Design a protein around this ligand. Sequence first.
Ligand SMILES: *[C@@H]1O[C@H](CO)[C@@H](O[C@@H]2O[C@H](CO)[C@@H](O)[C@H](O)[C@H]2NC(C)=O)[C@H](O)[C@H]1NC(C)=O
Ligand SMILES: *[C@@H]1O[C@H](CO)[C@@H](O[C@@H]2O[C@H](CO)[C@@H](O)[C@H](O)[C@H]2NC(C)=O)[C@H](O)[C@H]1NC(C)=O
Ligand code: NAG
Ligand code: NAG
Ligand code: NAG
Lengths: 48, 48, 196, 105, 126, 278, 49
Amino acid sequence: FGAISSVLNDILSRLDPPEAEVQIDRLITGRLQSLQTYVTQQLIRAAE
Amino acid sequence: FGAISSVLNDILSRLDPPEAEVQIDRLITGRLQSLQTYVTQQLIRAAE
Amino acid sequence: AYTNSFTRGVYYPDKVFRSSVLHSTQDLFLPFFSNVTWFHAIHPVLPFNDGVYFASTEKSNIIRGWIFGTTLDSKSLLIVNNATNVVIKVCEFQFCNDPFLGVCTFEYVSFKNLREFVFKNIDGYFKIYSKHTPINLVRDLPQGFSALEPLVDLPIGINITRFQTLLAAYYVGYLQPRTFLLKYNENGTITDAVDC
Amino acid sequence: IQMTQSPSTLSASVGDRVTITCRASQSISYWLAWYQQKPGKAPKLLIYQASSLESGVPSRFSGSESGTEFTLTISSLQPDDFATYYCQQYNSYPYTFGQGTKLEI
Amino acid sequence: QVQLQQSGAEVKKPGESLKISCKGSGYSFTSYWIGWVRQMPGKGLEWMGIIYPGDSDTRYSPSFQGQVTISADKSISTAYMQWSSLKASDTAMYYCARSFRDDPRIAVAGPADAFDIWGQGTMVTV
Amino acid sequence: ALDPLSETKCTLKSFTVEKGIYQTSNFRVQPTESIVRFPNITNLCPFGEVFNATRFASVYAWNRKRISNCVADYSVLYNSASFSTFKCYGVSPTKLNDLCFTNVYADSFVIRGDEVRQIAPGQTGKIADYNYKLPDDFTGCVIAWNSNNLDNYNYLYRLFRKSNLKPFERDISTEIYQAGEGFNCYFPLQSYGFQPTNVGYQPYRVVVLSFELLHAPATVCGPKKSTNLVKNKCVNFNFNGLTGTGVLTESNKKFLPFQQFGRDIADTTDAVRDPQTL
Amino acid sequence: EVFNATRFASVYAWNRKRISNCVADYSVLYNSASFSTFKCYGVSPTKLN
Ligand SMILES: *[C@@H]1O[C@H](CO)[C@@H](O[C@@H]2O[C@H](CO)[C@@H](O)[C@H](O)[C@H]2NC(C)=O)[C@H](O)[C@H]1NC(C)=O
Ligand SMILES: *[C@@H]1O[C@H](CO)[C@@H](O[C@@H]2O[C@H](CO)[C@@H](O)[C@H](O)[C@H]2NC(C)=O)[C@H](O)[C@H]1NC(C)=O
Ligand SMILES: *[C@@H]1O[C@H](CO)[C@@H](O)[C@H](O)[C@H]1NC(C)=O
Ligand SMILES: *[C@@H]1O[C@H](CO)[C@@H](O)[C@H](O)[C@H]1NC(C)=O
Ligand SMILES: *[C@@H]1O[C@H](CO)[C@@H](O)[C@H](O)[C@H]1NC(C)=O
């Protein structure tokens, strides 16, 4: 999701809180958008 | 979508990679969110 | 002379162990069922544009080393082993234009059998990919699959655009950045692949 | 950071290894050139930039450095090594020189 | 054959002027930095003064202000050290100094060192 | 926080909750201990040979030294005030002492003052264009000193060239000028305008610690101490920088001599080869 | 006439010159070291020409 790494633990161990906030925000936006697509598709298929 | 231009080729022919990356990131975020809204609307309309 | 490269030219892409998965990668590889050139040795400096998969059909170990560089004349990789010590250097060696052994810049001193070799440099990382198997055939390259693993990691960082052997059927298939489908077995061994 | 050179005289024989010092006069870490002078002729470079060998001088003459105290070293003495030598820094203006050393039988 | 063709020995008395030479032969004289180092008899060398002969950029040492006027002549290649009032203290073997060349010689060619090759030596005896 | 009844009341936001079953929180087994696992690589690394180094090369011929079998003690280096700017992007300036790399490269070169911003991922300029460029996704830290006191016509830079050079690439050429062999086109390399007699026009030396986080046998780790290995106990383990909570059981997997660790579909590390005992 | 020009105006009376019918040879401008920093926001220093 545009982040420098996909391993959350690696991001936490590598980045100081200042830039880690932006990186984790990017990762959260990406993962939450993917989970929103997941719940929408899952709920449409569940309505079917 | 908050970008400095609405044409992908216009963005490319003007911005070097180091900042075109962020500009295209914004543009693709907007366009992907629009496609997501569109496919969700298409999915619910197709369920109907 | 040319031959069909049935399945040979596949190596382990990374150092990550897997089991019963289907991981796809896109790197420099030899495409399947492609055209590769054949050479016989009864009774040649070629380019190195984007990586050359070297296959060797050795019977009496005539090929003892290879050169990788631009000059290749008294100035550049060398691999030599006098049956007792494997010596590999990339020096600006003082050897003849046709160097041989009778019967530095890297300042650390490093048919019946098929010695496959993928000599490539990734940011200088000279990984030696090899796998040996016994055969009995003289016609051409036998069909078979073997997953090659990296043996030694030497940061050569030298420019390779030409190569010359040191006194077999070499197939200069320029590895192209093509997507490949790899399959790891339960024991973490590549059993089959698909040039997709 | 004071300039002190040793010794006043050095007595030895052929095949001997000797070690003298040219302590740094100031912060001259980067640029220092070592000079070899024979009696009656112009000096010649030993080690310029304190880490590079010069041309025309045998390898038995060498120089070293250690923080604020540097070194001039002769690994294998020869019968013609009976002369006087000077060391010089050129990191900062102006440049200073050495004192010398004499050998006797 | 890079050679600082330094002038011969001059025998004079205090008071008059002198024009000494450090000539380039077989190379470009403007390349190597011409450093002026003074070596008194019986002792080592000593940095007495400096001039950049490219544009007559002259820097007189504090102990030589007003008494010594160092200059340079590029036509006949005589790098100058003019004592407008010659001094008996300046009787010494004067070695005009070249600069070393070990890394990117064509780039700088100057100020690398103070001894590359010297001529027979201009022995200024005042 | 008292009892599950109050937890249910809290998650329902009502003093009187209806009869039924409700999810309130997640039961997590807390780590009982802390395991530290690192290889016996106690060989200290000569970081002085690059920080206390008396010699440095120019940017046109920047030397690189592969670092392996080392101990990276960044404590004194970080605490030292010799670093005027310490801008770490892929890692943190304060979290250096606990990380462990598999292999890293050390590059040393000299740059001017106004071009300090050019030593960064995604930058341009004379050097970043024709002499030396960094990866757009470079991971590591940039070390630049106030070398005005420390660091003279022997520092070179390129002016004309065909195009940009790949990151970490070394191109050395002393001829073939762009337009204007012994013709107007001549030596395309010029020296910096420094001198022992000579703020922004003063030299600033730069060192880059290119931290390659590629998966490989670990060679350079921080000054950490290993602990005893327990099994079947969720603890805060640390296997060569890999942290997490879980159990360490003797697996029957047959790792190949080159394969270091395994992964699952979730791209998470499924198995880890203990670096001390194979 | 706008970069290497001798006389220039102040900031409180900033002058402006309409530029038309031109061949914008950005090559010399960009490769020349006359610009300490080139902070472009809609364009790029290398993508000028
Ligand atoms: C390795 O050497 C080859 C030359 O054999 C280089 O190829 C050339 O690239 C230069 C770039 O300036 C061109 O001027 C030449 O015309 C090219 N020649 C050919 C035959 O392609 C190659 O760039 C070098 N690679 C590295 C990494 O140094
Ligand atoms: C780098 O070099 C300096 C200079 O020698 C080192 O500093 C000295 O530090 C040691 C360590 O305690 C002291 O014993 C010396 O007395 C110090 N020198 C002086 C003149 O006081 C330094 O330790 C070296 N390493 C680092 C990482 O800076
Ligand atoms: C490879 O191409 C050559 C033409 O250059 C052809 O003669 C040869 O038969 C081809 N090989 C195969 C296996 O088709
Ligand atoms: C092989 O060569 C190496 C050096 O190239 C030498 O040290 C070794 O003794 C040689 N061995 C034999 C058996 O000749
Ligand atoms: C402006 O003048 C300077 C004077 O040295 C010159 O270097 C520069 O190239 C000129 N700029 C343009 C765009 O011609």
